[PDB]
Scaffold this active site. Structure first.
Site, PDB file in Angstrom:
ATOM      1  N   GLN A  11       0.827  -1.207   0.000  1.00 59.71           N
ATOM      2  CA  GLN A  11       0.000   0.000   0.000  1.00 59.71           C
ATOM      3  C   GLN A  11       0.857   1.250   0.000  1.00 59.71           C
ATOM      4  O   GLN A  11       0.590   2.205  -0.738  1.00 59.71           O
ATOM      5  CB  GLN A  11      -0.890   0.010   1.240  1.00 59.71           C
ATOM      6  CG  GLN A  11      -1.860   1.163   1.382  1.00 59.71           C
ATOM      7  CD  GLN A  11      -2.919   1.152   0.362  1.00 59.71           C
ATOM      8  OE1 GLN A  11      -3.440   0.098   0.045  1.00 59.71           O
ATOM      9  NE2 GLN A  11      -3.303   2.322  -0.127  1.00 59.71           N
ATOM     10  N   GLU A  61      -3.086  -6.744  -1.937  1.00 61.36           N
ATOM     11  CA  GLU A  61      -4.460  -6.265  -1.888  1.00 61.36           C
ATOM     12  C   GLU A  61      -4.803  -5.565  -3.196  1.00 61.36           C
ATOM     13  O   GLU A  61      -4.165  -4.553  -3.537  1.00 61.36           O
ATOM     14  CB  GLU A  61      -4.672  -5.327  -0.698  1.00 61.36           C
ATOM     15  CG  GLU A  61      -6.125  -4.960  -0.454  1.00 61.36           C
ATOM     16  CD  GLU A  61      -6.338  -4.301   0.893  1.00 61.36           C
ATOM     17  OE1 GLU A  61      -5.344  -4.100   1.621  1.00 61.36           O
ATOM     18  OE2 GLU A  61      -7.500  -3.983   1.226  1.00 61.36           O
ATOM     19  N   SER A 130       7.029  -0.094   3.556  1.00 59.58           N
ATOM     20  CA  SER A 130       6.930   0.433   4.906  1.00 59.58           C
ATOM     21  C   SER A 130       7.219  -0.681   5.896  1.00 59.58           C
ATOM     22  O   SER A 130       6.759  -1.812   5.718  1.00 59.58           O
ATOM     23  CB  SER A 130       5.549   1.021   5.177  1.00 59.58           C
ATOM     24  OG  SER A 130       4.533   0.084   4.874  1.00 59.58           O
ATOM     25  N   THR A 135       2.531  -6.249   4.094  1.00 57.84           N
ATOM     26  CA  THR A 135       3.161  -6.452   2.794  1.00 57.84           C
ATOM     27  C   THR A 135       4.542  -5.808   2.756  1.00 57.84           C
ATOM     28  O   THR A 135       5.500  -6.383   2.230  1.00 57.84           O
ATOM     29  CB  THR A 135       2.267  -5.894   1.685  1.00 57.84           C
ATOM     30  OG1 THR A 135       0.973  -6.501   1.766  1.00 57.84           O
ATOM     31  CG2 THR A 135       2.854  -6.200   0.323  1.00 57.84           C
ATOM     32  N   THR A 169      -0.278   3.918  13.216  1.00 58.96           N
ATOM     33  CA  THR A 169      -1.491   3.472  12.544  1.00 58.96           C
ATOM     34  C   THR A 169      -1.866   2.049  12.919  1.00 58.96           C
ATOM     35  O   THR A 169      -3.009   1.790  13.304  1.00 58.96           O
ATOM     36  CB  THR A 169      -1.323   3.578  11.024  1.00 58.96           C
ATOM     37  OG1 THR A 169      -0.263   2.713  10.601  1.00 58.96           O
ATOM     38  CG2 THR A 169      -0.994   5.009  10.623  1.00 58.96           C
ATOM     39  N   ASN A 218       3.701  12.013  -0.159  1.00 54.55           N
ATOM     40  CA  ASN A 218       4.389  11.141  -1.101  1.00 54.55           C
ATOM     41  C   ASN A 218       5.094  11.929  -2.197  1.00 54.55           C
ATOM     42  O   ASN A 218       6.042  11.423  -2.806  1.00 54.55           O
ATOM     43  CB  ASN A 218       3.391  10.153  -1.695  1.00 54.55           C
ATOM     44  CG  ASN A 218       2.807   9.229  -0.652  1.00 54.55           C
ATOM     45  OD1 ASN A 218       2.701   9.589   0.520  1.00 54.55           O
ATOM     46  ND2 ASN A 218       2.405   8.042  -1.070  1.00 54.55           N
ATOM     47  N   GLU A 244      28.012   3.503  -5.919  1.00 52.69           N
ATOM     48  CA  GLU A 244      28.922   4.378  -5.195  1.00 52.69           C
ATOM     49  C   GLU A 244      28.388   4.645  -3.794  1.00 52.69           C
ATOM     50  O   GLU A 244      29.161   4.890  -2.860  1.00 52.69           O
ATOM     51  CB  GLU A 244      29.085   5.685  -5.970  1.00 52.69           C
ATOM     52  CG  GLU A 244      30.259   6.574  -5.604  1.00 52.69           C
ATOM     53  CD  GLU A 244      30.025   7.430  -4.398  1.00 52.69           C
ATOM     54  OE1 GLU A 244      28.869   7.761  -4.081  1.00 52.69           O
ATOM     55  OE2 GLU A 244      31.021   7.810  -3.750  1.00 52.69           O
TER      56      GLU A 244
HETATM   57  N1  LIG Z   1       4.632   8.035   3.279  1.00 47.30           N
HETATM   58  C1  LIG Z   1       3.621   7.204   3.046  1.00 47.30           C
HETATM   59  N2  LIG Z   1       3.364   6.173   3.924  1.00 47.30           N
HETATM   60  C2  LIG Z   1       2.339   5.321   3.696  1.00 47.30           C
HETATM   61  C3  LIG Z   1       1.542   5.468   2.577  1.00 47.30           C
HETATM   62  N3  LIG Z   1       0.606   4.494   2.605  1.00 47.30           N
HETATM   63  C4  LIG Z   1       0.802   3.731   3.705  1.00 47.30           C
HETATM   64  N4  LIG Z   1       1.869   4.240   4.392  1.00 47.30           N
HETATM   65  C5  LIG Z   1       2.446   3.727   5.642  1.00 47.30           C
HETATM   66  O1  LIG Z   1       2.098   2.375   5.845  1.00 47.30           O
HETATM   67  C6  LIG Z   1       1.946   2.150   7.228  1.00 47.30           C
HETATM   68  C7  LIG Z   1       0.996   0.997   7.492  1.00 47.30           C
HETATM   69  O2  LIG Z   1       1.065   0.050   6.455  1.00 47.30           O
HETATM   70  P1  LIG Z   1      -0.272  -0.300   5.639  1.00 47.30           P
HETATM   71  O3  LIG Z   1      -1.244   0.855   5.698  1.00 47.30           O
HETATM   72  O4  LIG Z   1      -0.893  -1.558   6.193  1.00 47.30           O
HETATM   73  O5  LIG Z   1       0.240  -0.524   4.133  1.00 47.30           O
HETATM   74  P2  LIG Z   1       1.321  -1.655   3.762  1.00 47.30           P
HETATM   75  O6  LIG Z   1       2.649  -1.299   4.370  1.00 47.30           O
HETATM   76  O7  LIG Z   1       1.513  -1.785   2.280  1.00 47.30           O
HETATM   77  O8  LIG Z   1       0.695  -3.037   4.297  1.00 47.30           O
HETATM   78  P3  LIG Z   1      -0.633  -3.665   3.635  1.00 47.30           P
HETATM   79  O9  LIG Z   1      -1.783  -2.694   3.710  1.00 47.30           O
HETATM   80  O10 LIG Z   1      -0.998  -4.936   4.357  1.00 47.30           O
HETATM   81  O11 LIG Z   1      -0.364  -3.978   2.186  1.00 47.30           O
HETATM   82  C8  LIG Z   1       1.404   3.447   7.792  1.00 47.30           C
HETATM   83  O12 LIG Z   1       1.946   3.694   9.066  1.00 47.30           O
HETATM   84  C9  LIG Z   1       1.866   4.501   6.813  1.00 47.30           C
HETATM   85  O13 LIG Z   1       2.854   5.301   7.410  1.00 47.30           O
HETATM   86  C10 LIG Z   1       1.788   6.508   1.691  1.00 47.30           C
HETATM   87  O14 LIG Z   1       1.084   6.653   0.694  1.00 47.30           O
HETATM   88  N5  LIG Z   1       2.832   7.372   1.929  1.00 47.30           N
HETATM   89 MG   LIG Z   2      -2.311  -3.337   1.801  1.00 49.42          MG
END
Ligand SMILES: Nc1nc2c(ncn2[C@@H]2O[C@H](COP(=O)(O)OP(=O)(O)OP(=O)(O)O)[C@@H](O)[C@H]2O)c(=O)[nH]1
Ligand SMILES: [Mg+2]
Ligand SMILES: Nc1nc2c(ncn2[C@@H]2O[C@H](COP(=O)(O)OP(=O)(O)O)[C@@H](O)[C@H]2O)c(=O)[nH]1
Ligand SMILES: Nc1nc2c(ncn2[C@@H]2O[C@H](COP(=O)(O)OP(=O)(O)O)[C@@H](O)[C@H]2O)c(=O)[nH]1
Lengths: 430, 50, 49, 427, 52, 192, 427
Positions: A11, A61, A130, A135, A169, A218, A244
């Site tokens: 995500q 997802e 993240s 994921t 979160t 982002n 490098e």
């Molecule tokens: N900077 C940034 N962080 C994001 C973004 N979307 C999700 N996150 C980070 O992802 C963290 C939680 O992970 P999820 O919301 O579950 O997303 P994921 O890491 O892909 O895990 P899944 O939803 O299971 O696929 C949050 O604390 C956010 O900080 C984004 O668009 N920009």
């Molecule tokens: Mg997800």
């Protein structure tokens, strides 16, 4: 002929890429459709005119990765490399790495191999995810395990969304963060760390706009990636590639976790009122307020720092911009690394995205350093894990997902030696 | 000559964008008009019942 | 009566699940051989070297 | 695509269940006949979650409707959105269950349970990735608990990897509506503690006040009360049928909540619940919604959270907003009010943001909360049960249809040990 | 008679449930190892070169 | 403590894995010793795991306290008649029916009945279509892939673990339907 | 081109054919008298199969309708599509065959046989390459059981090659219409096993079930039961009257559905048989018309196929369809129920596909399946026979009409043998 493959997972990793690939579309003058109105490093060519980005967007997802293939950028991406999932991760390390991770690997690595065959001179990789999400923790660390044996010597750079010290979160987020750091220690190269709440802080103070969201969050991450990799494509006075970054960000193979900083983050109105010189934009990097991760640099010691400049930077005024830094005492330098610095110079001023909050400056520098103040940031996360694992809090889901409990003890044990390296770094030697 | 024949293939392969998409839209209306035709047939048999 | 009836439906499901189980066991044990044939191919060129 | 079968079994079930389908079609733009008639496209892109398509627009709902005596079911038919359901789904017997668990869980029940699981099995094979089930029981009662429990248990043995959320009305605290409701609850709660994943205690006394104090409705009927319970179910499952910034499938909202594998009972809650002509004097910002969100006066359950300790709380915000504001207000909560949150899990709040606002409401925010204060409800039912079992009251009408006293004794033991489990964390 | 052929097939099903589980675990050992299968040969291909 | 280990362990038991469930059952024994409720729960999880003897130990060590726990009364299904020989288990199936009816007890009663009156060819007869798996899980043992290490255990252990249960189920099916009785059934059918 | 000479025999047959001739009359277009009024040449094209050309563009059918009581044929005329039938192809006696196989097979009947064989001969040699010689009739009556099985006999002697299909009605298991049903049926199944080459057992008890447990009807007329049977017929002869992708006539549905000379008794079954209210709620994906065919319910023969091992099954699919969906779905069947399909024949399933669907639908099929479950049908009839000859009951009306007792015993034997052989291959 010198390209690199960027894989965006999760995500978080996909939504970074959507706000990051719009920068490459705007720097090169690429249309959203995919045709022209050099590209080589981040864009391929199917001998016709339709530019194809060398990126694979993998997620478990489908509901978010569907937005990429239905929105404006649906024609740009290859519909089969942009792979969806069937079952979701649910913030589980034990799911995205052991249960549903393994069923989306026999073809994802097949995509990376075919994208590797299309290249001739690859030297690097680039990963967005993240540490908190399922994921971005489980599926990422399986990719590190796979890429360590498939390719090996090739560089594997990384950008992450760090656990925010104050806000959060997910609540199994420290569970995901410790286990993904366990696998990333030996099967990765350099892991550039960014968190959320510090960007929320710098979007208040430096940027005039309030109420920021994931669009502005982002796009700034899209800026730090575009600034760090612009030296591949544009000719500059002092150039730099991804391999490098290996030898001057890590002195020890255990520590590979530096930080990012964008210096000229300013609004449209405020840039009328000050001039942006490379002497003033350099010491604006080192202020703890402008630091993109909430780690106070006075607690730690700077180990190695990288300053990648863009636009009409004059190298006469970059060493004077650094000689001011070393003479002042609020940045701590000691004997075991008296050199500590490097710069990289590019000739391309940073582009502006329509609707963006950044001002179209010409002197943009990105500060990239690893500090020993990450120790106190990890002195709470291991305490975070030791406050939940002390009476077996949420881990029944993990042992319900193919996980044996025994790795958590040696996940502590392997992580416990990590700050033991940190206390070995900070001590002076006589 | 190699440039304009890859361009010639560019127009030739983007015509299969529009022909196949229109064929898909014509196929979905053809099966939809079959559904009304079976339903308007049921309208005629419900007449002679009435 | 409903007992006997419901019990027929039940036995059917059991014998049918057993069947699909043998199927996946048979989709495998062919692809297991598809993981043994190159398994029985490198060590003949490993022992060559 | 993930799928959720809506198993509704019983008077209160087939009632709110209907409302659920009304407060779901409106969003996905479906008419009371089965045909997409909406505005934005994002609406049929994920109709494959509650509505299976039929021939040419007829989105036949994937709902299995069960009862024991043709009545509540016929009401759902002869009504508004009432013919959308496929005939077969309507599985009914002939006799009633006179709120007697024994009847719905032993003597009769079985008779129809076989047929009920048949329709379920069928609509389970017609799925790409079954996420889970969504039972709707009235607990205290017969066709509600008696049957649901039977079905719930059967499902968990057939699909042992699915999130079965069970929006259930909890035996009311103050004025009950069944002289034998304590008995029913005891046996019920026992089963929905070892066979479920995310229950949601939707009490009545609470809802009958939230409409009297907040909405200021002069004549709250069951109709209005169900709009509230329906909304929560739509919220829990909004990031599975619409786009967003931080999506949260049910499994996610469970893992980040159900702590130890038993305290899985949560307290429901909606966000923008102002009256008709009072809106003018009230804004709609994440700040404002959060006051209400965490205000214990707007909880659809009875127990007061300020008499226990929030173990883990989640919120599925739906609307275009600022993730910063979301985190900022939630952060303040944990700090400003710390004692009311447990300390062994610092991050105690979970945020989620689906970017498709509800109908006629710019920003909605369903809140689900695992609060230890639930001890009160459990204790109350245990207490009332204690009084009846003692002087063997209304028991020949339960043990009469196959239910040894030891069954109800075992039941009490479990219900009481749940209270122990919760209090053990409060201290 | 019908219960006796239910439980007999319920018995026969579970001894087919086990055989699936022991074959999938047998697969998993072969799958991970087929990854390291090539570069081991490449290392030994260079071994013939180095002692040449 | 104890309520976490049951709830995951029962859920793991239903979820197809039985090795990890029995571990979660076993950790609960280090909370309270005489815990009939959980002792039967192991033996349900241990019969399904192919092995037999530990399940009997947990079955007996449950019902050595009091013969009143109807769930544990279900567990003694794994005694002699169903595990071998040609008669026993009905002696307990009937005494379980003296307790609460429990339609599942009757299933055992109807099964334990007039059956008390009773290499390649033998294996293919006694074992059904899984006899293709039985020989093939033994023909995969004549190689060098056996000497490996998956996780803690060995690959040869797993290749013999499936063979161990299939050999155990071979005698279990032989005891229920004897080869001698099979000849009598065929002879009587053809003659009539 | 090949053709088929219907031999509508017996009262039940007279009716079974009348609704059938109306069904084929429509599919092809021949209106309630003859004048073709279709809407696609695909129809007329090959009408020769079941219709002879006359003058003024009339297509009088090719059916030697027969009986022994001048009344049923009289109704067959005074009905709907009845003017079509020729006024000469109606062979009618005067003395009824008072429900007595003898009266119809040895006495009264014979007298008519010569006249029938004459007409048959005529309409038969008036062709190019006749492909068949069906005979719709019941086996529990007099004319059918009697004259019908004599016609089948003398025709298999005159033309000793053309396929001899025989859509037959075998006495129902439970409720019966006659009392001497056994004797008649048993005797008919002996002059059918060593004569016909494709008998299709259709049972009324079974049919009723498919008109109340599947068609949700409440007042089924014998006529509506006959329409379900007529559909089976159209299907078995569809890939010969309308084009397709994998065509299969009668000879093919034989060399791929009968694994031994004697074993020739096949059970039928249609595919899309849904009720009105539900007609719209259900989709017609090929998977659906595959589930509603292999189920024990949708089987026009009351012999649970779950108690046997289909020696071979077929599927004359009809309708523009995807050959993948078909073959793929048919493999899922081939495997999902490998414990219900004998193994001595590796793959047991013939998949034909036409193009022109049944008038007013989208897809269809016939489950002509040779199962060892038909062993039960004859055993129930035999259980009854041996329970009457034992006491020489209702036998004075048979021995009379030039008939010996050894004949009766010979039927028990030739029937016992079929049942016995069917079990030898079920093991
Ligand atoms: N900077 C940034 N962080 C994001 C973004 N979307 C999700 N996150 C980070 O992802 C963290 C939680 O992970 P999820 O919301 O579950 O997303 P994921 O890491 O892909 O895990 P899944 O939803 O299971 O696929 C949050 O604390 C956010 O900080 C984004 O668009 N920009
Ligand atoms: Mg997800
Ligand atoms: N939310 C809601 N609750 C209802 C409704 N109708 C009844 N109830 C509750 O259901 C409880 C009694 O349930 P009951 O009728 O016995 O359910 P049954 O056993 O399945 O018939 C009462 O306490 C009511 O508060 C309704 O329409 N909506
Ligand atoms: N399916 C069906 N069966 C019928 C019909 N009419 C009669 N039958 C069957 O045929 C039998 C009646 O015998 P009948 O045909 O008059 O005897 P026959 O003409 O002398 O052979 C009954 O057992 C019915 O089951 C009909 O319209 N449909």
């Amino acid at each position: 002929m010198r390209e690199c493959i960027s894989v965006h997972v999760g995500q978080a990793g996909v939504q970074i890429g959507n706000a990051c690939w719009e920068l490459y579309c705007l720097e090169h003058g690429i249309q959203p459709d995919g045709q022209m109105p050099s590209f080589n490093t981040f864009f391929s060519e199917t001998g016709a005119g339709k530019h194809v980005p060398r990126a694979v967007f993998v997620d478990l997802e489908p509901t978010v990765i569907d937005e990429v293939r239905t929105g404006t950028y649906r024609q740009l991406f290859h519909p089969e490399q942009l792979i969806t999932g069937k079952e979701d991760a649910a913030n589980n390390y034990a799911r995205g790495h052991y249960t549903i991770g393994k069923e989306l690997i026999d073809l994802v690595l097949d995509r990376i191999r075919k994208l590797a065959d299309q290249c001739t001179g690859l030297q690097g990789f680039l990963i967005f995810h993240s540490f908190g999400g399922g994921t971005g923790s489980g599926f990422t660390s399986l990719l590190m395990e796979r890429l360590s044996v498939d390719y090996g010597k090739k560089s594997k750079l990384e950008f992450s969304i760090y656990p925010a010290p104050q806000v959060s979160t997910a609540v199994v987020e420290p569970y995901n963060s410790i286990l993904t750091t366990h696998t990333t220690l030996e099967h990765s190269d350099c892991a550039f760390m960014v968190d959320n709440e510090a960007i929320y802080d710098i979007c208040r103070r430096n940027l005039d706009i309030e109420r920021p969201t994931y669009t502005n969050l982002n796009r700034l991450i899209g800026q730090i990636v575009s600034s760090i990799t612009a030296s591949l494509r544009f000719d500059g006075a002092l150039n730099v590639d991804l391999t490098e970054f290996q030898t001057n960000l890590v002195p020890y193979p255990r520590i590979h976790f530096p930080l990012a900083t964008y210096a000229p983050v300013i609004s449209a109105e405020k840039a009328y009122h000050e001039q942006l010189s490379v002497a003033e934009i350099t010491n604006a990097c080192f202020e703890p307020a402008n630091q993109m991760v909430k780690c106070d640099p006075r607690h730690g010691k700077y180990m190695a720092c990288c300053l990648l400049y863009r636009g009409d930077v004059v190298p006469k005024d970059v060493n004077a911009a650094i000689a001011t830094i070393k003479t002042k005492r609020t940045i701590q330098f000691v004997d075991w690394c008296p050199t500590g610095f490097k710069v990289g110079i590019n000739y391309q001023p940073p582009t502006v995205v329509p609707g963006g909050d950044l001002a179209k400056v010409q002197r943009a520098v990105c500060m990239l350093s690893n500090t020993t103040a990450i120790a106190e940031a990890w002195a709470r996360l291991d305490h975070k894990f030791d406050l939940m694992y002390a009476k077996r809090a949420f881990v029944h889901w993990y042992v319900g997902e193919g996980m044996e409990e025994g790795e958590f003890s040696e996940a502590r044990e392997d992580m416990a030696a990590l700050e033991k390296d940190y206390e070995e770094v900070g001590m002076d030697s006589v | 000559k190699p440039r304009m024949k890859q361009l010639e293939h560019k127009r030739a392969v983007e015509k299969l964008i529009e022909e196949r998409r229109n064929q898909f839209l014509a196929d979905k209306q053809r099966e939809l008009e079959e559904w009304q035709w079976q339903q308007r047939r049921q309208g005629c048999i419900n007449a002679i019942v009435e | 009566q409903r007992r006997i009836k419901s019990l027929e439906n039940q036995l059917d499901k059991v014998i049918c699940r057993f069947d699909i189980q043998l199927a996946q066991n048979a989709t495998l044990r062919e692809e297991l051989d598809l993981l043994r044939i190159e398994r029985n191919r490198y060590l003949n060129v490993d022992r060559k070297l | 695509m993930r799928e959720i079968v809506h198993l509704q079994a019983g008077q209160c079930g087939n009632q709110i269940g209907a409302k659920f389908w009304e407060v779901i079609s409106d969003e996905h733009g479906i008419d009371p006949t089965g045909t997409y008639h909406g505005d934005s496209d994002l609406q049929l892109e994920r109709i494959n979650v509650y509505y299976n398509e039929a021939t040419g627009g007829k989105y036949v709902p994937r709902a299995v409707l069960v009862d024991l005596e043709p009545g509540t079911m016929d009401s759902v038919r002869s009504g508004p959105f009432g013919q959308i359901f496929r005939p077969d789904n309507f599985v009914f017997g002939q006799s009633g269950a006179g709120n007697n668990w024994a009847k719905g869980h032993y003597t009769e029940g079985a008779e129809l349970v076989d047929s009920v699981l048949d329709v379920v099995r069928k609509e389970a094979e017609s799925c790409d990735c079954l996420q889970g089930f969504q039972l709707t029981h009235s607990l205290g009662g017969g066709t509600g608990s008696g049957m649901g429990t039977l079905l719930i248990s059967k499902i968990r043995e057939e699909y042992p990897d699915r999130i079965m959320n069970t929006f259930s009305v909890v035996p009311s605290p103050k004025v009950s509506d069944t002289v034998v409701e304590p008995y029913n609850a005891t046996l019920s709660v026992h089963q929905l503690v070892e066979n479920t994943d995310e229950t949601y205690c939707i009490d009545n006394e609470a809802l009958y006040d939230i409409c009297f104090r907040t909405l200021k409705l002069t004549t709250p009927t069951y109709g209005d009360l169900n709009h509230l319970v329906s909304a929560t179910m739509s919220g829990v499952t909004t990031c599975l049928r619409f786009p967003g910034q931080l999506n949260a499938d049910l499994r996610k909202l469970a893992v980040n909540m159900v702590p130890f594998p038993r305290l899985h009972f949560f307290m429901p809650g909606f966000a923008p619940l102002t009256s008709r002509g009072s809106q003018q004097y009230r804004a709609l910002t994440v700040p404002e919604l959060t006051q209400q969100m965490f205000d214990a006066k707007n909880m659809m359950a009875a127990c007061d959270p300020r008499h226990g300790r929030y173990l883990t709380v989640a919120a599925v915000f739906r609307g275009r907003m600022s993730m910063k504001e979301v985190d900022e207000q939630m952060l303040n909560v944990q700090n400003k009010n710390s004692s009311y949150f447990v300390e062994w899990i610092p991050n105690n709040v979970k945020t989620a943001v689906c970017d498709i606002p509800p109908r006629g409401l710019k920003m909605s925010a369903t809140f689900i909360g695992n609060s230890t204060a639930i001890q009160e409800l459990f204790k109350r039912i245990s207490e009332q049960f204690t009084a009846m079992f003692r002087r063997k009251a209304f028991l020949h009408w339960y043990t009469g249809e196959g239910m040894d006293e030891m069954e109800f004794t075992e039941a009490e033991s479990n219900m009481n040990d749940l209270v122990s489990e919760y209090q053990q964390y409060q201290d | 008679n019908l219960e006796n052929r239910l439980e007999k097939a319920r018995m026969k099903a579970e001894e087919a449930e086990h055989i699936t589980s022991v074959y999938l675990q047998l697969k998993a050992y072969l799958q991970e190892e087929s990854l390291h299968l090539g570069n081991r040969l490449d290392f030994m291909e260079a071994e013939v070169v180095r002692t040449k | 403590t104890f309520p976490s280990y049951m709830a995951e362990g029962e859920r793991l038991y239903l979820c197809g894995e039985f090795a990890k469930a029995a571990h979660s059952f076993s950790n609960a024994l280090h909370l309270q010793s005489g815990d009939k409720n959980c002792l039967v729960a192991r033996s349900k999880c241990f019969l399904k795991m192919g092995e037999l003897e530990k399940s009997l130990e947990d079955a007996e060590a449950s019902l050595q306290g009091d013969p009143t726990f109807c769930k544990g009364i279900l567990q003694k299904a794994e005694t002699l008649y169903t595990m071998g020989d040609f008669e026993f288990a009905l002696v307990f199936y009937h005494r379980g029916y003296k307790l609460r009816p429990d339609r599942e007890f009757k299933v055992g009663i109807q099964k334990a009945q007039e059956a008390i009156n009773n290499k390649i060819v033998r294996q293919l007869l006694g074992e059904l279509y899984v006899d293709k798996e039985y020989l093939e899980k033994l023909l995969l043992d004549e190689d060098l892939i056996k000497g490996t290490i998956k996780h803690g255990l060995t690959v040869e252990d797993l290749i013999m673990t499936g063979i161990n249960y299939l050999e155990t189920r071979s005698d279990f099916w032989r005891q229920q339907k004897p080869i001698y009785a099979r000849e009598r059934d065929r002879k009587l059918m053809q003659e009539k």
